[PDB]
Nucleic acid binder design. Structure first.
Lengths: 37, 148, 210, 239, 287, 210, 244
RNA sequence: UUUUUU
């Protein structure tokens, strides 16, 4: 009855970074990972 | 000297072809006979075919055998229209311009070696002094032995 | 003995449109590009249903009156099958460019439009396909005629059929037939629709390999 | 026969122009008005200046001005009567190239939300129409005082028998084949617009381009006099 | 209703231009990998300049001639932007780009004297061939000029017209079944090459695609020949350029017209060798 | 015992009816709709199930769905609200007081033509959608203006649904090779940034080329 | 051009190839009116309609209703039917139809008061089925009756009559001619006046030859004709109102 | 400018 797609299967995170390239980005990714786990 | 039109190519028999006996109703088979053809070197088409054989009673059986173009070209057709327009085959120094398309005159009526083809034949019962008593006209299928 | 000629179908050729379907039927060829749900002008604002535009263009000459009638037939078939109540105040544009005209344009056009509406992702209730029969002077019918069979015959019928229960969706006519001939052409069209609807499922499995 | 013993059909050599006379300020009802003639080609240009957008208000750009150019030929120009409605294709192009050349150097930066219209009407075409229209529009703009980068001059050139020709007539555009018109602003030498419809070979190209630019510079050395003469006989009446 | 370009798109793409690197990875002087395909019947071609498809069709009829020109045939061009090509190409909205392409194609392939008009006249003043070509833009991701010129030249090369025989005053045409259709008389193959100028003529580029046309401010078209003759040139976009730039541009355009003429000749030879042995559509080199 | 839930890893055709066994009702995904006691299929795709049934299709046009992370582009501003292009049917709205720590005294710095990362709060068929850049508690978890100097491009939604699984392949290799940072957006949009331009181009090609 | 079914390239009428000498219709009384059959409200899907018949002249009119200082603007479209008259005109027309439409628009605005219609428009559509005679005047009269039955506010009706001049040695004005009496004619005139306010609403008449006195006599004779013609239109609109 | 093979 809902056309969603994030709360159907499973998504990943918000604004995923890599190679500690940026900064605040790593922490946000870690928080997303914590939410996932 | 224009190349052949597309509707005329449709009226040829199909290119994978062998001898079909169902069209040989009035025809007689003479594969056992030896028949050779002599030709000025380097032809694609050939139409002459001969044999001579001694009979038991001192007589001779002489056969002139001709390729049957008429078994393939029905009247009123567009291939008949092309052959009625051109009429004869024009020969030049470098190349020639055939009246019949190259498929038919190259393979399906040129009496190649050691293959059977349709033919229209005349048989003479001629003596050792070569005068003729009886003459026969027939449709046949002919397997030539050699080209010379 | 009634069977179609050779089918070929290709998806996702063009980059810019939302869907792309090339459909090769024998020698004829129709390419269809469909824009998805997009913005409308204010004049076509319909609050219940979605506007569904169809543009049909042949390759020689500029398009005329008969092509306008054909594209109205396309818009009515599609809005019969496109579940358009789900998307209000949006416009779906279906564009058809005739690549090769070898006979029975409307069948190949409807097949290309159906594949293009599938691949673009517009929600529909059912599939649909188009076939054609040709009635000669004697009465022997031919499914999917060539241009020469279309030219010689006394009747040409084109039917667009549905996928759920094989019902008649669209019908166009150039001929002088009787009703029993109509019934026989409809039955042969249902058999041909069975073959084409299997051909849809085979190509849609051929896409999703990865 | 076009050029034999160095002389052309008109009786002029390969470098010199036609006689061109430009008059400013014809229509006092409008804002800027110019009338120019190059030989027998008559051109008339009217510009209504930076007025606000009257209708269809979504067309306005927020930063720069908008330039609208419309080319209309008279119906009695050549021998055969031609009709400007239902004959729009040639004209639509001739307007859009004028739009290009006058969005090139008109300084749209100083006039936000502003519409500048340039209307050019040709009264008698005798070859070299495009250059005459651009020159008429330049004189018309410099009537109305829209501040622009540079004086704009355009001319044409051809290539016959190994020699370059400047400022072609209708005869020389008819039989010849190589036409090359250009619009030029001479303070920096920057070619503002190129047009060429020919079968011209590459090894000659630079030569005729130089001659084309040279003809343009001659136009800039003539019309300038007219403008200064005009503005001089303004100031004597003022102060 | 088209999607607008980002500011960051503009800034990143201009910074990419300032170090001589494209988006896809080619150099500044490289056309995309082209592909020529043919239709079933004569004169139907599909040109892919690389995610940009142009359809080309040649039709031909018998029309009474124009009165001033009694002894040659009329060419009539139509380049129509299809609806599927770009979402902003609604009919009647894009008049400017339509006229700007149409007149350029018409001037090139008419006033270049590319294909003969004098070979067409059947009966002077009464019957003459009339050739109409139609180009449809199917997918818009680059130069419509270059792909349109390629498609028009390939369609003029591939087209065949039915024979007519003139005997006294009898004009007897034939069906394509009754006679072989003869090919058309062509002098040479002129072609168009598009150049993109960025930030007032500092940086020269060849063959911009969609983003690369949205960020640019100058376009130039040079039409050249096999024998290295320049047919037509046209500037657009409101830029100012020195003559040294077009003098160096003609040379690169000559190299490119030589390569694409090689590609078109390989295309025609491969299609003809396909149709000699059973009949099909002849793909063509995509390099 | 056919066409209820047996084909749970196959490719369905749009329109083939399937039903659920048996009160305990289930929830339908994006492709399926309800009809009495059966489920109507509207798209092509492969059916997947998790305990909900859902089908996925590689389609380009995004439909506005409530609560998704979407990169949008500022169109213009009109007073308090400013409009954003999403790539959908109608452009969405933003209020300047919806950003983190903003009132009438402090305007958030939003310029015309800058990309914005946020999420839709209201998105249905009835009205135009509206998005925000704040969490439910009242803070920004990386939302707002992305900034400049990073290449934006557009991909298929199926690629995003493949890459943002917890089981992925390309993202870990890309993070292993060298430094960079990227932003995904559920309408099919990817923003990238590396230290140099060449690595940014190689990243863009490797991301879009599969 | 391509929105209609094309046919032959060029066609000719048969009457020019017809070999016959058609006689003049002879002599008549000058003030001999044609019998008038008018009825209003004939159509259903239009807001107001009128049908007017006079001898061999037929005309129909219908009015689309109002749709969205400021002043109303009635723009009127005048199409002739393609099979009215000997020669067949093109279905767009384009030359003569806009010329008659300006006569309609400049004759109807003194009738319809437009201060009561801010930012609205009215579409008056007239259609001429059979060109038996005075073509402009019957269109004016039927458009006036259709606007009256449509329910827009007016000051008066519009009654129009056409005139014509026989080209004999003594030029004598004729009133309400037939098509043959226009084909023989030299000069034809058409007036229309609101009979209650007694003011001319529009006069359009092409000339061949005349003098200033003769045009004055023709104008006052046309005024007498329209004033004479009025009560049949009155009783017809009364009966059409009694149907309501 | 017959005549037989091309």
């Amino acid at each position: 009855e809902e056309q969603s797609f994030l709360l159907c299967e499973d998504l990943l995170y918000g604004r995923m970074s890599f190679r500690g390239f940026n900064p605040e980005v790593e922490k946000l990714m870690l928080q997303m990972n914590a939410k996932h786990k | 000297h224009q190349p052949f039109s597309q509707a005329v190519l449709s009226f040829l028999p199909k290119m994978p072809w062998s001898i079909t006996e169902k069209d040989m109703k009035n025809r007689e088979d003479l594969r056992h006979l030896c028949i050779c053809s002599v030709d000025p070197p380097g032809c694609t088409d050939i139409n002459d075919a001969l044999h001579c054989r001694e009979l038991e009673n001192g007589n001779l059986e002489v056969g002139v055998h001709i390729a049957d173009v008429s078994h393939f070209i029905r009247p009123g057709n567009a291939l008949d229209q092309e052959s009625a327009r051109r009429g004869t085959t024009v020969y030049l120094c470098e190349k020639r311009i055939d009246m019949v398309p190259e498929l038919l005159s190259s393979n399906l009526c040129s009496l190649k070696c050691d293959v059977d083809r349709l033919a229209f034949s005349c048989i003479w019962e001629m003596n050792h002094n070569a005068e003729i008593l009886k003459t026969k006209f027939t449709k046949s299928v002919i397997n030539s032995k050699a080209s010379l | 003995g009634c069977s179609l000629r050779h089918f070929a179908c290709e998806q996702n050729l063009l980059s810019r449109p939302d869907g792309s379907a090339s459909f090769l039927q024998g020698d004829t060829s129709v390419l269809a590009g469909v824009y998805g749900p997009a913005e409308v002008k204010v004049s076509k604002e319909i609050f219940n249903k979605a506007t569904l535009e169809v543009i049909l263009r042949p390759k020689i000459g500029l398009p005329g009156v008969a092509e306008k009638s054909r594209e109205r037939l396309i818009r009515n078939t599609c809005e019969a099958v496109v579940l358009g109540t789900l998307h209000p105040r949006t416009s779906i544009t279906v564009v058809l460019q005739v690549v090769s005209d070898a006979g029975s344009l409307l069948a190949c056009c409807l097949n290309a439009a159906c594949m293009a509406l599938v691949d673009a992702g517009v929600p529909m209730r059912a599939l649909f396909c188009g076939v054609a029969c040709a009635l000669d002077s004697d009465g022997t019918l031919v499914l999917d005629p060539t241009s020469k069979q279309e030219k010689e015959a006394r009747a040409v019928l084109t039917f667009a059929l549905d996928s759920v229960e094989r019902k008649l969706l669209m019908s166009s006519t150039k001929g002088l037939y009787s009703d029993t001939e109509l019934q026989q052409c409809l039955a042969a069209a249902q058999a041909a629709s069975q073959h084409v609807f299997r051909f849809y499922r085979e190509s849609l499995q051929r896409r999703y390999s990865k | 026969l076009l050029s034999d013993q160095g002389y052309r059909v008109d009786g002029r050599r390969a470098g010199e122009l036609r006689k061109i006379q430009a008059r400013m300020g014809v229509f006092a009802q409008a804002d800027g008005s110019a009338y120019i003639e190059q030989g027998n080609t008559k051109a008339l240009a009217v510009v209504y200046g930076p007025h606000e957008i009257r209708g269809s208000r979504a067309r306005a750009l927020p930063d720069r001005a908008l330039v609208n150019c419309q080319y209309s030929s008279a119906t009695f120009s050549t021998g055969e009567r031609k009709r400007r409605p239902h004959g729009d294709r040639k004209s639509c192009e001739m307007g859009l190239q004028l739009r290009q050349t006058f969005e090139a150097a008109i300084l749209t930066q100083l006039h936000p939300r502003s519409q500048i219209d340039i209307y050019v009407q040709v009264l008698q075409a005798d070859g070299g129409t495009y250059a005459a229209c651009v020159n008429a529009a330049t004189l018309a703009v410099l009537d109305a005082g829209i501040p622009m980068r540079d004086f704009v001059c355009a001319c044409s050139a051809g290539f016959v028998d190994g020699t370059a020709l400047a400022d072609l007539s209708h005869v020389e555009e008819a039989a010849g084949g190589p036409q090359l018109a250009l619009a030029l602003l001479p303070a920096s030498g920057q070619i503002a617009l190129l047009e060429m419809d020919a079968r011209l070979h590459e090894d000659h190209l630079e030569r005729v381009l130089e001659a084309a630019a040279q003809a343009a510079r001659d136009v800039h050395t003539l019309l300038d006099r007219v403008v200064r003469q005009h503005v001089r006989e303004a100031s004597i009446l003022l102060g | 209703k088209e999607t607008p370009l980002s500011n960051c798109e503009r800034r990143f793409l201009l910074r990419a231009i300032e170090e001589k690197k494209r988006l896809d990875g080619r150099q500044t002087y490289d056309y995309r990998n082209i592909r020529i395909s043919f239709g079933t019947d004569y004169g139907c071609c599909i040109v892919e300049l690389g995610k940009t498809r142009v359809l080309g069709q040649v039709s031909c009829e018998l029309v009474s001639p124009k009165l001033n020109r009694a002894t040659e045939g009329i060419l009539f061009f139509n380049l129509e932007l299809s609806q599927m090509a770009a979402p902003a190409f609604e009919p009647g909205r894009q008049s400017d780009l339509l006229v700007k392409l149409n007149r350029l194609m018409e001037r090139c392939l008419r006033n270049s004297k590319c294909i003969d008009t004098e070979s067409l006249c059947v009966v002077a003043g009464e019957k003459v061939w009339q050739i109409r070509v139609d180009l449809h833009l199917l997918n818009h991701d680059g130069n419509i000029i270059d792909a349109a010129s390629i498609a028009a030249i390939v369609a003029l090369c591939h087209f065949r017209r039915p024979d007519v025989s003139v005997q006294g005053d009898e004009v007897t045409l034939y069906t394509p079944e009754e006679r072989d259709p003869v090919p058309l008389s062509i002098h040479h193959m002129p072609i168009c090459v598009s150049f993109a100028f960025f930030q007032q003529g500092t940086y020269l580029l060849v063959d911009p695609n969609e983003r690369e046309e949205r960020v640019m401010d100058g376009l130039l078209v040079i039409a050249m020949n096999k024998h290295r003759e320049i047919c037509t040139i046209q500037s657009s976009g409101g830029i100012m350029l020195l003559k040294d730039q077009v003098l160096r541009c003609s040379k690169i355009a000559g190299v490119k017209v030589a390569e694409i003429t090689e590609l078109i000749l390989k295309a025609l030879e491969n299609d003809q060798k396909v149709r000699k042995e059973g009949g099909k559509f002849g793909f063509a080199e995509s390099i | 015992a056919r066409a209820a839930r047996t084909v749970l890893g196959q490719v369905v055709l749009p329109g083939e009816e399937l039903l659920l066994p048996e009160r305990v009702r289930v929830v339908c995904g994006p492709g399926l709709r309800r009809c009495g006691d059966r489920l109507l299929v509207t798209k092509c795709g492969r059916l997947r199930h998790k305990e909900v049934y859902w089908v996925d299709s590689q389609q380009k046009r995004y439909v506005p769905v409530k609560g998704d992370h979407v990169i949008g582009i500022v169109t213009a501003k009109s007073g308090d609200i400013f409009k954003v292009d999403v790539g959908g049917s109608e452009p969405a709205s933003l209020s300047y007081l919806s950003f983190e720590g903003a009132t009438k005294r402090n305007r958030p710095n939003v310029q015309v033509g800058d990309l914005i990362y946020g999420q839709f709060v209201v998105a249905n068929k009835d009205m135009e959608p509206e998005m925000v850049c704040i969490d439910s508690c009242g803070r920004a978890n990386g939302m707002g203006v992305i900034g400049q100097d990073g290449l934006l491009f557009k991909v298929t939604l199926g690629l995003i649904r493949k890459l943002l699984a917890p089981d992925c392949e390309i993202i870990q290799e890309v993070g292993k090779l060298y430094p960079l940072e990227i932003v995904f957006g559920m309408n099919g949009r990817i923003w990238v940034k590396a230290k140099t331009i060449q690595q940014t181009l190689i990243l863009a090609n490797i991301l879009e080329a599969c | 051009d391509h929105r209609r079914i094309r046919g032959p390239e060029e066609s000719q009428p048969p009457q020019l190839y017809a070999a016959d000498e058609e006689e003049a219709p002879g002599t008549r009384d000058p003030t001999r009116l044609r019998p008038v059959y008018a009825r209003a409200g004939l159509l259903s899907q239009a807001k107001g309609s009128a049908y007017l018949e006079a001898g061999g002249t037929k005309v129909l009119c219908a009015v689309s209703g109002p749709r969205q200082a400021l002043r109303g603007r009635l723009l009127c479209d005048f199409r002739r039917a393609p099979f009215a008259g000997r020669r067949r005109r093109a279905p767009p027309g384009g030359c003569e139809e806009r010329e008659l439409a300006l006569a309609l628009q400049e004759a109807l605005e003194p009738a319809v008061r437009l201060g009561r219609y801010p930012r609205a428009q009215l579409e008056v559509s007239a259609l001429l089925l059979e060109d038996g005679g005075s073509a402009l005047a019957a269109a004016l009269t039927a458009a006036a009756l259709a606007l009256a039955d449509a329910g827009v506010e007016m000051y008066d009706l519009v009654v129009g009559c056409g005139l014509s001049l026989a080209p004999g040695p003594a030029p004598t004005w004729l009133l309400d001619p037939t098509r043959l009496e226009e084909e023989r004619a030299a000069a034809g005139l058409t007036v229309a006046l609101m009979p209650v306010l007694n003011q001319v609403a529009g006069l359009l008449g092409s000339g061949e030859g005349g003098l200033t006195e003769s045009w004055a006599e023709a104008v006052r004779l046309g005024l007498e004709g329209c004033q004479r013609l009025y009560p049949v239109l009155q009783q017809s609109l009364v009966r059409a109102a009694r149907r309501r």
